[PDB]
Design a protein around this nucleic acid. Structure first.
Ligand SMILES: [Mg+2]
Ligand SMILES: [Mg+2]
Ligand SMILES: [Mg+2]
Ligand SMILES: [Mg+2]
Ligand SMILES: [Mg+2]
Ligand SMILES: [Mg+2]
Ligand SMILES: [Mg+2]
Ligand SMILES: [Mg+2]
Ligand SMILES: [Mg+2]
Ligand SMILES: [Mg+2]
Ligand SMILES: [Mg+2]
Ligand SMILES: [Mg+2]
Ligand SMILES: [Mg+2]
Ligand SMILES: [Mg+2]
Ligand SMILES: [Mg+2]
Ligand SMILES: [Mg+2]
Ligand SMILES: [Mg+2]
Ligand SMILES: [Mg+2]
Ligand SMILES: [Mg+2]
Ligand SMILES: [Mg+2]
Ligand SMILES: [Mg+2]
Ligand SMILES: [Mg+2]
Ligand SMILES: [Mg+2]
Ligand SMILES: [Mg+2]
Ligand SMILES: [Mg+2]
Ligand SMILES: [Mg+2]
Ligand SMILES: [Mg+2]
Ligand SMILES: [Mg+2]
Ligand SMILES: [Mg+2]
Ligand SMILES: [Mg+2]
Ligand SMILES: [Mg+2]
Ligand SMILES: [Mg+2]
Ligand SMILES: [Mg+2]
Ligand SMILES: [Mg+2]
Ligand SMILES: [Mg+2]
Ligand SMILES: [Mg+2]
Ligand SMILES: [Mg+2]
Ligand SMILES: [Mg+2]
Ligand SMILES: [Mg+2]
Ligand SMILES: [Mg+2]
Ligand SMILES: [Mg+2]
Ligand SMILES: [Mg+2]
Ligand SMILES: [Mg+2]
Ligand SMILES: [Mg+2]
Ligand SMILES: [Mg+2]
Ligand SMILES: [Mg+2]
Ligand SMILES: [Mg+2]
Ligand SMILES: [Mg+2]
Ligand SMILES: [Mg+2]
Ligand SMILES: [Mg+2]
Ligand SMILES: [Mg+2]
Ligand SMILES: [Mg+2]
Ligand SMILES: [Mg+2]
Ligand SMILES: [Mg+2]
Ligand SMILES: [Mg+2]
Ligand SMILES: [Mg+2]
Ligand SMILES: [Mg+2]
Ligand SMILES: [Mg+2]
Ligand SMILES: [Mg+2]
Ligand SMILES: [Mg+2]
Ligand SMILES: [Mg+2]
Ligand SMILES: [Mg+2]
Ligand SMILES: [Mg+2]
Ligand SMILES: [Mg+2]
Ligand SMILES: [Mg+2]
Ligand SMILES: [Mg+2]
Ligand SMILES: [Mg+2]
Ligand SMILES: [Mg+2]
Ligand SMILES: [Mg+2]
Ligand SMILES: [Mg+2]
Ligand SMILES: [Mg+2]
Ligand SMILES: [Mg+2]
Ligand SMILES: [Mg+2]
Ligand SMILES: [Mg+2]
Ligand SMILES: [Mg+2]
Ligand SMILES: [Mg+2]
Ligand SMILES: [Mg+2]
Ligand SMILES: [Mg+2]
Lengths: 74, 62, 50, 86, 159, 134
RNA sequence: AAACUUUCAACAACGGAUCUCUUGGUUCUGGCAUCGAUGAAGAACGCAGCGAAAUGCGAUAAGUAAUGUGAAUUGCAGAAAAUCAUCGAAUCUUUGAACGCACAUUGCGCCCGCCGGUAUUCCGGCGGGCAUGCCUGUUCGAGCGUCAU
RNA sequence: GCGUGAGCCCGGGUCGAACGGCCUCUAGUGCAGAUCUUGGUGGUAGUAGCAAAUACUUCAAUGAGAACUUGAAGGACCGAAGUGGGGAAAGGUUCCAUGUGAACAGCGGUUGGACAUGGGUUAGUCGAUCCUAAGCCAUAGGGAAGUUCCGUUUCAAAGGGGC
RNA sequence: UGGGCGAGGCUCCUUCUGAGUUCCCUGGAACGGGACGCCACAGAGGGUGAGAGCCCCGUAUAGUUGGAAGCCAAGCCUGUGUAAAGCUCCUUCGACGAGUCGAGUAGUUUGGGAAUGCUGCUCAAAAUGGGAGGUAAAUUUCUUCUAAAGCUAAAUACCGGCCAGAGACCGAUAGCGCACAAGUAGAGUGAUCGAAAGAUGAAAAGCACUUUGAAAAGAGGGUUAAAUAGCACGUGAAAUUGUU
């Protein structure tokens, strides 16, 4: 509900909690996952080790029903 | 005009072709669609099996 | 110009006939809202496109 | 250019179109800039929704098309009410 | 631009998705329309059940190998074993599938028994009431408690 | 409470229909009750008002005034009653518009048409009463 | 001290905010499938006792027939229903896919028939016709493409 | 009068048909700014200004009112590549008569191309209509998915004279 | 195995629908307040001079008046096996779509990756053959269908068109550009662009008449519940202005 949101509390305060120096611009740093091997590499390496590259072989037209074998313990 | 058109319709009764103003004006598509007999025509092959195996009236007891 | 086609002359006739104030008895009808001719045109004010 | 050149404006690029009635018939090309006359199809473009709706069906009299729904509702019947003078 | 420990976003909204949004405010109205159509077709099929008899069928893959369900229609071999003519089956509420085969005696026998039970429970009215034939119900056992839903009265007893 | 899907309880639609009704519908809209004597005589509760009817005003500043209906101005949803009038500045006399629901009909203008109407209403009312009393 | 400027208040101006209203929008849901060469959509010009527009209509022109209802319409006048509903019969100007050829022209033709002017030939009036692509059929034809006498 | 405060309540006036408190629910929910949007209104300010094209004056009539209405007289200008008399384009009734409150004629206005009510355009000989020019559009054909492009006599069985 | 009726039912058009305007107060007007009653399968909505179940239209319910005949249909009446049709078995036979499939190459496309579909060009088939079986190739099996001809309700999309019902929506700078003679007035050569603008009062009862003025108007007077509600019309803020 809108009456519980913090925007109601920011009324009367210029910059709406986004700061005066940094101004809530459109897309600083890029959209989506831009700069994964660049300015966002520090994040993409601290979290998500293994984001980039290939591992293993491919299976064209994988039919998941071939591998149906749910297990139960004694 | 009404009397003249009534007389003309009487004259053109049982005639194959009658003037366009006397012909019924339903709709272009309605006038162009197939006649009832032509649309209901079926093949002899269909007619035989329709005669000998139609949808029956049946019930299934519980 | 003095040289006119029949179509142009006819349209000028129609414009001239439309150039008039509204009848007085119109304003006396029940529910009337027309105060004046809002589509009035003058040869010095608004140019008609043929 | 400007005021002095505007004084030479005493010719007509466009005249009245016979099909749409607008003063958009190019006098030399003999083609209407609005309705596309004399082409058989009426000029219409999907990048001008306003232009399309200015002349779509329903902006005129609909002399014949307005009577079709009633005739359909009554089934395109013919004849006269059982018991009518004539 | 990621900023914290987030799952990597992959929301496929880079096309103009708003141009193809399908809301479902017509769900109850469509249900009402469906119920009306069902009632109308049941009334049209006045004494008959509203559906066709379906066979028991085993689901294909190694997953779902364990479960049976309803199939499309009975095979020619099943109809022949049950003694129901091929041209007569679809006119008495039996679905026929000409492209399914009976590779196993178990499925063949199960479907044949199903067809035989249906034929035993079938009430066949004569084409003309004043001259019934030998293959029709003779007007005495023509009154009984009938079923109008073969999907329930002839469902999968144990999938 | 309304049930039938063909009936609508829209205020906008009701007002539009009322204020743009054609003349024949306005005739039915401008109905008036009958007096007690006429109601007992004809077994009819209300009828559309007609020019030449005799009415008594039972609401408004002109209560208890009686007179003949001299005009039924449907366009203005009013009637004009004889001698129920007003004076302009010039002293000229103009009729006062009275809504038919504010009057009661004390004497009816009767001709076969106005009567086939009363017989239809009476027969319908009697049948409805009998069916409800079954 | 007045005047002037400013401040405060009452009244009066200017302006159209606020409040209340809403025959209008907007959104959702349900039913239905019906344009046109038998001339559509659209455009033009006209039509009322007194109308410029809007609405309606087409020289039968604010409408005709027919059915239903049952006494109006209304601004004035007038008269003996209605600016009513419904709508199956008609009318439906010039146009427009637009169709004799054209059209920036109310331009220029041809055919059939009738009526007048001494008239198959000219002129005038009236009515009906004359587009293209294609299908089926009809009839008249072309070709040493080809068959028999 | 209450509350630190945002605000809340009351008195008086105006006014005329709906509205509020409490607990939940909901949002297109709180403005001084954005050369913000729309609308309205100021100081400037009775101010800048209304000074090209030689120029007006007397008497009389009209009228509530006359420098810019009219009559007469005088004085002047345009000075036949005119401020003259007629046309083409363009305008469309501005033309004529009668009447005139407001608005407009950046002063006035009795006057007006303004407003209002009525009139006015007469052709075998003047034009269009006929002819062809530059050119444009058909046709036969050929391109092009197609809207359509070329083509104008071109690889076409394309007509008019008499008895 | 062919034909014809068909009660009866569902449709369709049409007639018809309960109850206060009782007494008192306020008011210009009760539709407000108080008292006493009534109807309710109807207390949805709207109008009527202010909040009306009973003043009026409608509203609920299945019925009913008269009519057209659109559908379905229990069951009846009546032809008849030359013909045509199904089933049970069988030695044998068993026709089956070509510049098509397929292959190469090029372009495009696809999640389709030594190439998913499509198309252009070149090559160009076969008869248990052929296609497919998501890694290119040869060989051997297996599985599954049967291309290059064709028709076909429904469940599905869509508020563009014609009707209808609604909303925790907007309320005249909002809501569609348009609540109004709005795709109008107006602008542009043109393609196109494109506004502003709702509310007197219950009822015009829209101010007779006198007087001053050339007139516009003013002052009296009149209408109304109200004119500071007077067609510059409900209320009438601020900016800004005049007087005191
Ligand atoms: Mg802070
Ligand atoms: Mg900032
Ligand atoms: Mg910085
Ligand atoms: Mg930052
Ligand atoms: Mg030039
Ligand atoms: Mg053409
Ligand atoms: Mg139009
Ligand atoms: Mg985008
Ligand atoms: Mg102070
Ligand atoms: Mg004001
Ligand atoms: Mg408001
Ligand atoms: Mg026509
Ligand atoms: Mg023709
Ligand atoms: Mg033709
Ligand atoms: Mg010419
Ligand atoms: Mg000639
Ligand atoms: Mg002669
Ligand atoms: Mg002739
Ligand atoms: Mg002719
Ligand atoms: Mg012939
Ligand atoms: Mg030959
Ligand atoms: Mg009020
Ligand atoms: Mg906001
Ligand atoms: Mg502000
Ligand atoms: Mg701020
Ligand atoms: Mg501004
Ligand atoms: Mg200014
Ligand atoms: Mg000065
Ligand atoms: Mg100067
Ligand atoms: Mg000076
Ligand atoms: Mg000078
Ligand atoms: Mg004088
Ligand atoms: Mg002078
Ligand atoms: Mg000189
Ligand atoms: Mg000189
Ligand atoms: Mg010279
Ligand atoms: Mg001259
Ligand atoms: Mg000259
Ligand atoms: Mg020229
Ligand atoms: Mg003049
Ligand atoms: Mg004069
Ligand atoms: Mg002036
Ligand atoms: Mg002046
Ligand atoms: Mg003047
Ligand atoms: Mg004067
Ligand atoms: Mg004028
Ligand atoms: Mg000449
Ligand atoms: Mg000529
Ligand atoms: Mg020539
Ligand atoms: Mg060409
Ligand atoms: Mg070609
Ligand atoms: Mg009632
Ligand atoms: Mg009282
Ligand atoms: Mg009310
Ligand atoms: Mg009361
Ligand atoms: Mg009520
Ligand atoms: Mg095949
Ligand atoms: Mg191929
Ligand atoms: Mg392939
Ligand atoms: Mg290829
Ligand atoms: Mg490729
Ligand atoms: Mg492509
Ligand atoms: Mg590829
Ligand atoms: Mg494989
Ligand atoms: Mg299989
Ligand atoms: Mg095929
Ligand atoms: Mg196929
Ligand atoms: Mg198909
Ligand atoms: Mg708006
Ligand atoms: Mg406004
Ligand atoms: Mg707007
Ligand atoms: Mg323009
Ligand atoms: Mg207002
Ligand atoms: Mg007073
Ligand atoms: Mg006041
Ligand atoms: Mg007031
Ligand atoms: Mg006011
Ligand atoms: Mg102020």
């Amino acid at each position: 509900p809108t009456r519980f949101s913090k925007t109601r509390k920011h009324r009367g305060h210029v910059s709406a909690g986004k700061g005066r120096v940094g101004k809530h611009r459109k897309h600083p740093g890029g959209r989506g996952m831009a700069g994964g091997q660049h300015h966002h590499r520090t994040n993409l390496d601290k979290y998500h080790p293994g984001y980039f590259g290939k591992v293993g072989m491919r299976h064209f037209h994988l039919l998941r029903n071939h591998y149906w074998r749910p297990s139960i313990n004694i | 005009n009404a009397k003249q058109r009534a007389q003309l319709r009487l004259f053109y009764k049982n005639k194959k072709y009658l003037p366009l103003d006397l012909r019924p004006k339903l709709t272009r598509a309605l006038r162009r669609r197939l006649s009832k007999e032509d649309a209901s025509r079926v093949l002899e092959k269909t007619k035989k099996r329709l005669t000998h195996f139609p949808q029956r009236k049946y019930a299934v007891k519980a | 110009p003095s040289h006119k086609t029949f179509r142009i002359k006819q349209k000028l006739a129609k414009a001239q006939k439309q150039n008039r104030p509204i009848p007085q008895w119109i304003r006396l009808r029940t529910g009337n809202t027309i105060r004046y001719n809002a589509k009035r045109r003058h040869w010095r004010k608004t140019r008609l496109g043929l | 250019k400007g005021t002095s050149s505007f004084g030479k404006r005493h010719n007509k690029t466009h005249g009245l179109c016979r099909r749409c009635g607008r003063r958009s018939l190019h006098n030399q090309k003999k083609v209407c800039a609005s309705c596309g006359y004399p082409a058989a199809k009426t000029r219409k473009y999907n990048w001008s929704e306003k232009a399309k709706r200015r002349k779509v069906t329903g902006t005129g009299r609909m002399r014949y098309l307005s009577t079709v729904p009633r005739r359909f509702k009554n089934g395109f019947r013919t004849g006269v009410p059982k018991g009518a003078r004539g | 631009a990621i900023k914290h420990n987030q799952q990597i976003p992959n929301n496929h909204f880079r096309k103009h998705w708003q141009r193809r949004v399908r809301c479902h405010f017509d769900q109850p109205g469509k249900k009402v329309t469906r119920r009306l159509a069902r009632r109308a077709k049941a009334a049209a099929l006045a004494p008959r059940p509203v559906d066709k008899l379906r066979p028991i069928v085993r689901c294909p893959t190694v997953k779902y190998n364990r479960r049976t369900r309803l199939g499309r229609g009975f095979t020619l071999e099943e109809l022949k074993a049950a003694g129901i003519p091929r041209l007569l089956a679809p006119t008495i509420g039996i679905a026929v599938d000409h492209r399914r085969k009976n590779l196993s005696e178990e499925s063949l026998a199960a479907n044949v028994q199903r067809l035989k039970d249906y034929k035993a429970r079938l009430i066949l009215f004569p084409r003309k009431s004043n001259k019934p034939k030998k293959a029709d119900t003779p007007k005495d056992q023509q009154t009984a408690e009938t079923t109008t839903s073969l999907r329930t009265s002839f469902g999968v007893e144990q999938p | 409470m309304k049930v039938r899907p063909t009936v609508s309880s829209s205020r906008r639609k009701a007002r539009k229909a009322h204020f743009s009704a054609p003349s024949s519908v306005r005739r039915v809209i401008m109905s008036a009750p009958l007096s007690k004597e006429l109601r007992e005589k004809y077994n009819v509760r209300s009828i559309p008002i007609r020019k030449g009817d005799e009415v008594q005003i039972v609401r408004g500043a002109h209560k208890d005034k009686e007179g003949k209906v001299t005009s039924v101005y449907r366009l203005k949803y009013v009637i004009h009653v004889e001698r129920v009038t007003r004076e302009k500045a010039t002293g000229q006399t103009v009729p006062i518009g009275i809504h038919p629901s504010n009057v009661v009909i004390t004497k009816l203008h009767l001709d076969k048409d106005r009567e086939n109407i009363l017989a239809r209403i009476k027969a319908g009312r009697e049948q409805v009463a009998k069916a409800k009393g079954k």
